[PDB]
Amino acid sequence: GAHWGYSGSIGPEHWGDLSPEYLMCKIGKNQSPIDINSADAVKACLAPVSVYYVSDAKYVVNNGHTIKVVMGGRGYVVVDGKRFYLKQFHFHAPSEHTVNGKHYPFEAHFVHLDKNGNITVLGVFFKVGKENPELEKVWRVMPEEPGQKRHLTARIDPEKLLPENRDYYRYSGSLTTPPCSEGVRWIVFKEPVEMSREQLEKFRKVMGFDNNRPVQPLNARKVMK
Amino acid sequence: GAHWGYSGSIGPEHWGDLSPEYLMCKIGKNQSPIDINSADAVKACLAPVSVYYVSDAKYVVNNGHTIKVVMGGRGYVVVDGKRFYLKQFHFHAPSEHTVNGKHYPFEAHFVHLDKNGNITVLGVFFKVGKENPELEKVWRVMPEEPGQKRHLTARIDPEKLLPENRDYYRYSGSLTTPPCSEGVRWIVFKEPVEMSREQLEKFRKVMGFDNNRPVQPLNARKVMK
Amino acid sequence: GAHWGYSGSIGPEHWGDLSPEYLMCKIGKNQSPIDINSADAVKACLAPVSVYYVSDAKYVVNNGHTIKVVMGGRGYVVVDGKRFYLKQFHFHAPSEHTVNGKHYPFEAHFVHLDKNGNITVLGVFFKVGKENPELEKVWRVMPEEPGQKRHLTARIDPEKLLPENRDYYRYSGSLTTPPCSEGVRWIVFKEPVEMSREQLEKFRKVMGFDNNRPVQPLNARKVMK
Amino acid sequence: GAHWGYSGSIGPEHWGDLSPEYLMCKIGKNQSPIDINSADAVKACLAPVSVYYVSDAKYVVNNGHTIKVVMGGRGYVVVDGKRFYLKQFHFHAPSEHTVNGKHYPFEAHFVHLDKNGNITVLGVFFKVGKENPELEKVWRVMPEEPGQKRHLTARIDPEKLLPENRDYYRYSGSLTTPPCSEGVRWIVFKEPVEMSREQLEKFRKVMGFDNNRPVQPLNARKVMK
Ligand SMILES: CC(=O)Nc1nnc(S(N)(=O)=O)s1
Ligand SMILES: CC(=O)Nc1nnc(S(N)(=O)=O)s1
Ligand SMILES: CC(=O)Nc1nnc(S(N)(=O)=O)s1
Ligand SMILES: CC(=O)Nc1nnc(S(N)(=O)=O)s1
Ligand SMILES: [Cl-]
Ligand SMILES: [Cl-]
Ligand SMILES: [Cl-]
Ligand SMILES: [Cl-]
Ligand SMILES: [Cl-]
Ligand SMILES: [Cl-]
Ligand SMILES: [Cl-]
Ligand SMILES: [Cl-]
Ligand SMILES: [Zn+2]
Ligand SMILES: [Zn+2]
Ligand SMILES: [Zn+2]
Ligand SMILES: [Zn+2]
Asked: Which terminus of chain B has fewer CB atoms gathered within 10 Å of its CB, N or C?
């Protein structure tokens, strides 16, 4: 795939024109992220998303578009009665999803694959408040330059990054970076978690730019709540 | 666009290869029709779909892939608080959608567009029982050869083709013929209506072939019920 | 308690005056049975009612107000996460509950107690159709006179009397015979099962009178569906 | 009816013994208030409760068991498609209802009657925060002694006491003071509003005692959410 970014000639509005591989950015009708209007969402009998994570975080990488924690892939969540294995988690500032037209300052994405390669992403909003103890373990060894990897000696428990309340919005969408492939299950937790002002500012300093894709039209979709 | 059909080298498994315009048949992850597994569908607080149809049928046409009644476009349904205007209705045998893995013998589609060109299709299943009086009005003047159009001798009341019970399944999908464009709202009524064996046989005889696209994978979607 | 019946001076409209013990018949605001208006019922995320019955039917008794099959009490259903043990099942003609103002010709009640004596009744509607094979085992030895008991040599499987579809209406109500105690959980299956005309007529012949309490006002209650 | 209170020999555990008129306190199985366990509540397709209140407050009264604002009865809410007219509102500290086993410091009740005398009570929880401007209008003229009534100097807009978010819990229950009559519709708003510590302390000082009835067992009921 061709080089892409968050501004200039290779920014989100141009992604669909950068490569034939990125065509869904241009033609897709089921794209992510979205604004979640809570009144427009349909109240629904959604199943609990059960979490069976393990502490198998291997390293943290700065890949030039996010900070990503890479996992061994043994932990999983249960969605639609199937195991989706946690491969990695990573971060955006400001939030990619909005709620009633408003951003949160930060959003984490936990990226899972089932045995057939189907993708489920769990989304967690963060607000500025108390220092997040689990996040601090990652932040302490944040790779400051693109291309850098840092081994984790501290034991990261990814379950501790999720909100205590597990209510969520669900919809069918896409990856938020090229090639923006569709057929992705989105589980967006309603309750935000806290990070310190200092934690937010370090991420923003290291990144050096905002890394959220603009919200995309719902089209025929409904969000369930 | 390129010629297509329901069998052989131009059949549904090949549509995505017949024309670059038909790419979504090949790469789409939100395609129609689908199997509706009722246990897998999510019980949800779905709004009533209000129907405000008018008797403005213009003609009936045999277009080589279905029998279609063309409307004036003044009647409408309300979905997501918006007016979707009835442009035409047409027929498939056997059914395109299945329920718990089983076909109905016949399925009608009512095709609507809102003021911005967004598409909603209402689907009505038919089972063999008593002769359908409203269907008979169209069947009496059925154009027997592809390319033929006939004037309607009786007044068509399209709402009389809908089931009395208005409970429905809803999902986001596509058109079921090339180019199989996505972003289509599907409203599939749960209760079937009746047609006579003779009515079904006249349709199958005039058509000369099955005209249902095979069901497509749900992928990330849920059906609401 | 005082003598009561289904007609005359001791009939349902007088039950509240027959004994101080029967006061809830007169003053209760949460009485059973009720008319279930399906449009007025609230669509709700009701849990499956899991059935763990055993074949421990002991005898059938004609107690002068119904025909009742008495169980050993080992089988149970799960409601609100608790085990409610099946103590007995018995019958009414015509139905006690109505649906949209209409009776079924027959209704069975499966009466359960949890470990603290809380009552749950499962209601099954019957319509006239094919002979019911499981019911026939009981009907073959139906005690014809009040006061008579008949031992069951045939092995009754009460699960086979429930509908195959397990969707239900739920509401909070009362026993339908004096003392009409409240705090009773009602689970009324939506789908009826069949019995033969002959089976219905034998029950009605043996009883000699209709044994349904008139429907009672919903008052502050909602039915969930 | 017999004299009753919130403590000692005339307290809530004894109400059912103080008068034959108070029998439901003792024998009722659908009593209020209750603990609302949010996980045990059933997610349901509840209709919005529309509010059409008017500024028709007549006076405020200290009646020896609460502070009550008496209304003209022209304002109303719509529940089950019917108009329930606002007759009065009053206050309890600590809260009568609990949520997940915890009290709020304060609870308001808006008491409504339909044209046939059926009762609906709307409940609003308060937490300590900023001074409540609408509450202050009443608090400024609070009658300090039982039996005293005061005219209202400012115009009372009762809708301004309701939370902005109108999501609610619903159940069927009773009045929370003798005779504790059943058949009462309860609408308990999920979102609390704020009052100052000083506002709460003035209420507790004037009252001289806690005025909440203990929570009552749910028995057969479910709470909808
Ligand atoms: C390799 C990989 O994981 N790609 C992703 N692209 N976007 C993602 S997101 N922001 O939708 O979670 S994950
Ligand atoms: C011109 C037009 O309406 N095209 C359609 N193609 N498929 C349709 S369907 N079967 O999805 O309703 S409508
Ligand atoms: C002893 C016993 O079971 N009493 C009952 N009275 N009414 C019942 S019913 N019709 O409500 O199931 S059960
Ligand atoms: C006269 C009158 O309204 N009596 C009430 N008793 N309890 C009520 S409450 N706390 O249930 O709202 S209202
Ligand atoms: Cl990523
Ligand atoms: Cl480390
Ligand atoms: Cl068509
Ligand atoms: Cl019409
Ligand atoms: Cl009985
Ligand atoms: Cl036998
Ligand atoms: Cl009061
Ligand atoms: Cl007001
Ligand atoms: Zn992401
Ligand atoms: Zn069609
Ligand atoms: Zn019974
Ligand atoms: Zn009160």
From this structure: N
CA separation for the pair A12, B192 (Å, rounded): 46
Distances (CA, A) of B93 to B15, B37, B87, B96, B157: 19, 20, 21, 8, 22
Domain containing residue B67: 1-225
Q: Tell me the pairing of strands D35-36 and D67-71.
A: unpaired
Number of domains in chain A: 1
CATH code (residue C59): 3.10.200.10
**C39–B contact, CB cutoff 8 A:** no
Secondary element (H or E) of residue A67 = strand A67-71
- Distance of residue B51 Cα from the nearest chain C Cα, in angstroms: 18
Alpha helix locations (H) across C59-157? 133-139
Structure token pair of residue B198:
């003779």
C97 is an active site residue: no
Question: E strands, D53-148, where?
Answer: 57-62, 67-71, 76-79, 82-92, 98-99, 102-103, 106-113, 119-128
What separation in angstroms does the CA of B51 have from each of A222, B55, B83, C213? 20, 13, 10, 40
Experimental method: X-ray
Give, using CA atoms, the residue closest to atom 12 of ligand 2.
Answer: B109
Q: Which tokens sit at D171?
A: 């159940």
Q: Token digits for C135?
A: 């019911």
Distance of CA B51 to the CA centre of its chain: 16
Cα dihedral value A100, A101, A105, A111, nearest 10 = 70
Indicate the resolution in Å. 1.9
Q: Which residues contact C36 (CB under 8 A, 6 or more apart)?
A: C97, C98, C99, C100, C169, C188, C223
Q: 3-state class of C74 per DSSP?
A: coil
Residue of B38, B42, B45 for testing the chain C interface, max C β-carbons within 10 Å: B45
- Cβ distance of C170 and D222 shorter than 8 Å: yes
- The candidate with the shortest Cα–Cα distance to C134, out of C113, C105, C104, C164, is C164
